[PDB]
Amino acid sequence: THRFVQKVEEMVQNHMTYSLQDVGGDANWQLVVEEGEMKVYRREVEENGIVLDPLKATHAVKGVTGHEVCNYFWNVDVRNDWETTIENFHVVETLADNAIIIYQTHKRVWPASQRDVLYLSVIRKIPALTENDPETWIVCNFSVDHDSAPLNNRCVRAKINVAMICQTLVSNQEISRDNILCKITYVANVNPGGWAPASVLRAVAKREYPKFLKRFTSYVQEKTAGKPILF
Ligand SMILES: O=S(=O)(CCO)c1ccc(-c2ccc(C3CCCC3)c([C@H]3C[C@H]3c3ccccn3)c2)cc1
């Protein structure tokens, strides 16, 4: 239906195969920040002296569904209500009702050059693998090449592979939001795309990933409160 259908299936299946695994028991992941049910881990990885540090976080959010969380994370029309590190944003291409290509710039992290990013953003429902298992809602944001890439001489091009992966547990009567819990696994593999001082990048990640997870999940709770549930 569009030229990236195969690529999207590969990227989504890779996350379903590899990104949901538990890391509580895994000494290969460093637990860097914990705030209640939010647990943020990383691995320290550098390629040619540039930090790549894979980031993986888990969180458990009361009173929202995975379909709601993924809709709010994917919908560009609400981005400004929760994002705090974006300078500019442009939708470059619409591929399908659930897949777009975006260009964005991030606020500069001194003393490195400002970064920009050009990525496909897709939202998918993955049916339960065995009938005992939960369904999954996933948003995957991953870098792609495009000709309508902006000339932006202030920016170095980063590359990203990010997924927000959600599974929803629920306890003639509707289910209340009191009885719904969204289990999130968030993974971010960011390649800065050129020089940056490692200690600064690592301090920024350790502050900004928890700040994002807290602000974004709180935002979804706030916007859904008192509205009918979208499962
Ligand atoms: O979840 S998303 O898809 C949401 C749509 O935007 C996402 C999140 C984060 C990034 C991103 C892009 C650039 C950087 C670095 C690279 C060198 C200089 C800036 C970082 C590192 C610094 C970390 C960070 C973490 C959270 C928010 C922003 N910054 C992160 C991109 C996309």
Partner residues linked to 182 by β-bridges = 61, 168
| Three-state DSSP string of 50-89 | EECCCEEEEEEEECCCHHHHHHHHHCHHHHHHHCCCEEEE
**Range 57-83 burial, b when 16+ CB lie within 10 A, else e:** bbbebebbbbbbbbbbbbeeeeeeebe
Determine whether the annotation assigns residue 72 to a binding site: no
- Broken C–N links (> 2.5 Å) in the chain, after residues: 171
Which two structure tokens, joined as six digits, stand for 92? 């470059």
Ligand 1 in contact with 160 (CB < 6 A)?
A: yes
**6 labelled binding-site residue:** no
Q: Is the CB of 115 under 6 A from ligand 1?
A: yes
* Cβ neighbours, 10 Å, residue 193: 18
The DSSP element (H or E) to which 212 belongs, if any, is helix 198-224
Give CA–CA dist 36/16, Å, rounded. Answer: 25
Residue 63, sorted as left (phi over 0), alpha (psi -120 to 50) or beta, turns out to be left
Q: Is 172 annotated as a binding residue?
A: no
User: Using CA positions, which residue lies closest to atom 30 of ligand 1?
Assistant: 190
Determine which residue's CA is closest to atom 2 belonging to ligand 1: 162
In the chain, domain spans: 1-231
Residue 182 burial class via C-beta count within 10 angstroms: exposed 0-12, middle 13-18, buried 19 and up:
buried
DSSP 85-108: SEEEEEEEEEEETTEEEEEEEEPP
Which protein residue has the closest C-alpha to ligand 1 atom 15? 192
CB of 158 sitting under 6 A from ligand 1: yes
Question: Is the omega angle on the peptide bond into residue 127 within 30 degrees of 0, that is, cis?
Answer: no
> In this structure, are residues 181 and 171 in contact, taking their beta carbons and an 8 Å threshold?
no
Among 3.30.590.10, 2.40.37.10, 3.30.530.20, 1.10.3720.10, name the CATH number for the domain at 1-231: 3.30.530.20
**Cα(173) to centroid(ligand 1), Å:** 42
Method used for this model? X-ray
Q: Is the C-beta atom of 114 inside 6 A of ligand 1?
A: no
Q: Is 186 annotated as a binding residue?
A: yes
